[PDB]
Design a protein around this ligand. Structure first.
Ligand SMILES: C[C@H]1CC2(CN1C(=O)Nc1ccc3c(c1)CNC3)CC(F)(F)C2
Lengths: 39, 156
């Protein structure tokens, strides 16, 4: 059986680590909820 | 059991030791996570039981104890924070500028951050701390890294 455990508050943190790029991708979403790249 | 607002880990004892299968948000007495984390199964919180209330495999979302409550949206301009809760590791805020998933049914924000299996369901927040969606459903690009959609439900 699955169980839950608290891990923290949901708040914005000032001066958090800023990372990651912002790609624009053409995608398709199928009936099973899976995304795939369209090229 | 615990119904205080916040981010929670989703654990199981079925496999070796205690394994983290995902993450979720408790808000207004409703537990929100991604469908692929629980597959719609019931959850435990101390001695109390959480039963699924709404779910959808295509959206890859599920709510427990009540209807989906999260309705904040990415504005299409500002940076956001992923409140990543990785297995065996402390909750950590990561700030990023989302990219875009362009689909035949419209555009969706996307975050290019990579975390282990078990981090799915971690919330994405705006500068006011509002949950604009959950992380964990997206695509694998050329390099092998992940780009997740900012997945949001609809508050009925
Ligand atoms: C490849 C990893 C990377 C990931 C998310 N992943 C998934 O496999 N997601 C996933 C699995 C099954 C289904 C769906 C999505 C929707 N349909 C069923 C862990 C992470 F959250 F850290 C980021």
């Amino acid at each position: 059986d699955m169980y839950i455990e608290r891990a923290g508050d949901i708040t914005w943190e000032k001066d958090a680590e800023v990372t990651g790029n912002s790609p624009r991708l053409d995608v398709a979403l199928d009936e099973s909820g899976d995304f795939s790249l369209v090229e | 059991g615990e119904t205080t607002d916040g981010v929670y880990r989703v654990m199981t004892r079925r496999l070796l030791g205690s394994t983290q299968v995902g993450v979720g948000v408790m808000q207004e007495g409703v537990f929100h996570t991604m469908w692929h984390v629980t597959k719609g199964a019931a959850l435990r919180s101390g001695e109390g039981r959480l039963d699924p209330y709404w779910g959808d495999v295509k959206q890859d979302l599920v709510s427990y104890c009540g209807p989906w409550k999260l309705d904040a949206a990415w504005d299409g301009l500002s940076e956001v924070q992923l409140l990543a809760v990785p297995p065996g590791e402390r909750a950590k805020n990561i700030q990023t500028l989302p990219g875009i998933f362009k689909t035949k049914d419209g555009d969706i924000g996307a975050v290019a951050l990579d975390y282990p299996a078990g981090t799915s369901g971690s919330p994405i927040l705006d500068k006011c701390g509002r949950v604009i969606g959950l992380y964990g459903n997206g695509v694998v690009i050329k390099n092998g890294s992940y780009v997740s959609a900012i997945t949001q439900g609809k508050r009925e």
